[model samples]
Target: MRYVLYVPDISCNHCKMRISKALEELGVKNYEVSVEEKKVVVETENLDSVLKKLEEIDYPVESYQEV
Candidate 1:
C-alpha cells in the first residue's frame, strides 16, 4: 500500500539517501520527499518494518498516513 511517512528530521539529500536506501532494500520502488512539508512519500509492504527501520536510522519518523 502507498503511505506517507512524516519524517520531521529529514532535511537534505543525505537524509533522502538514508530513507531511499532503506526503502530500496525493502524493495519499495516508489518514493519521494517533500522538503517543504518535511515529510516523505513512499510505497511499500509491511510498512511497520519500514517505519522501524527509519527509527533505527535515527530519521525519527514523526507520523504516517495512507495516501
Candidate 2:
C-alpha cells in the first residue's frame, strides 16, 4: 500500500535528509519527502510502524491517508 503523510514540520533540506535516514532505518525504500509540500509519500505495508518512527524522530505527522 501507499500513504501520503502530511508533515507540517517539513521545512528544509535538513529535515528531508533526517526523515530519509529515519525511513531508511525502518527499511522503507520507496519514499519521498517534499519540503515545499510538507508531505511524505511512502509505500509500505506497516503504516503504524512508520508513523511511530516519524514521531520518534520529531516529525510528527499532521494527518495521513492511503492512496
Candidate 3:
C-alpha cells in the first residue's frame, strides 16, 4: 500500500528531513517525502498507525489518498 499526505507548511529541507526522521523513528520504511512538493508518500500496510505517527509529530496531513 502507498499513502500520500499533503502538508502545506513544509517550507524547506529541514521540514523534509524532520518528516523523514519522524517516519524512520517509527520504523516506517519505503517512503518518499518532499518538502518542495508538499507531500509525504509512505509505503506500508499500517495506514492508521502511519497517520497516528504523523499526527504525534504535529505533521499536518491536509489531505491523503491511498494507492
Candidate 4:
C-alpha cells in the first residue's frame, strides 16, 4: 500500500534524516521524506507501525491518506 502523511513539524533536512532512520528501522525501505512539503510518502503493509514510529520520533503526522 501507498500512503501520504502530512507532518507539519518537518522543517529541515535533519528532520528528513531522522524520519528516514525511523522508517528504515521499521523495515520500511520504500519511502520518501520531503522537508519542503512537510510530508512523507511510504509504501508499507503496516501503516499503524509507521504512524506510531513517526509519532514516537516527534514528527507526529497531522493527517494521512492512502493512495
Candidate 5:
C-alpha cells in the first residue's frame, strides 16, 4: 500500500534526508517528496508503523485531501 505524510518542517533536502534515514529500518523500496505541497509520500507495507515512528520523533504530520 501507499501512504502520504505531510511534514511541515521539510523545507529542503536535509529534512527529507532525516526522514529517509529513519525509514531505512522499516524496509522501503523508494519514495519522493513534494516541496510544493510540503509533504512526503511513501510506498511500503507498514504504513501505521512508519507513521507512528514519525509522530514519535515529533515530525508534524500535515493534512492531505483531494482538491
Candidate 6:
C-alpha cells in the first residue's frame, strides 16, 4: 500500500529529522518525506503501525490519502 500524509506540523529540518528517525526505527525504507511540502509518502503493507508511530510522536496529520 502507498499512503501520502499531510503533516502540518512539519516545519523545518528538525521536524524532518524527527520523522526520518521515527520511520527509520520503525523499519520503513520505501518512503519519501519532505519538510518543505509537509508531506510523507510511504509504501508499506501495514499502514496502521506507521500511522500510530507518527501520531505517537505528536506529528499532527491534517489528512492522508492512498496514492
Q: Cα RMSD to native, each candidate?
A: 1.4, 0.8, 1.2, 0.8, 2.8, 1.0
lDDT of candidate 1?
0.80
In candidate 5, how many Å is residue 32 off? 1.5
Tell me the whole-model lDDT of each prediction, alpha carbons only: 0.80, 0.90, 0.81, 0.90, 0.70, 0.86
Cα lDDT of model 3 by residue, 2-52, tens digit:
988886656677788777888888788799888788888899878778778
lDDT of 6 at 4: 97
Query: Model 2: clashing residue pairs?
Result: none
Worst 10 residues of 2 by lDDT: 9-18
Candidate 5 local lDDT, residue 52: 76
Model 4 CA lDDT for position 67 = 91
Q: How far is candidate 2 from the true structure (C-alpha RMSD, Å)?
A: 0.8
lDDT of 1 at 42: 76
Once model 6 is optimally superposed onto the true structure by TM-score, how far is the C-alpha of residue 24 displaced, in angstroms? 1.0
For every model shown, what is its TM-score relative to the native structure? 0.83, 0.94, 0.85, 0.93, 0.72, 0.90
Tens-place lDDT digits, model 6, residues 5-36: 88877878789877779998988879988988
Query: How would you encode candidate 4's per-residue C-alpha lDDT over 1-67 as one tens digit per residue?
Result: 9899998778887788888888988999799989999999999999999999999998779989999
Instruction: Spell out the clash pairs found in candidate 1.
Output: none
Model 3: residues with Cα > 4 Å off, grouped in runs: none
Model 6 superposed RMSD (Cα):
1.0
**Error at 40, model 5, angstroms:** 1.0
Task: Give lDDT: candidate 3, residue 50.
Answer: 76
lDDT of 4 at 1: 98
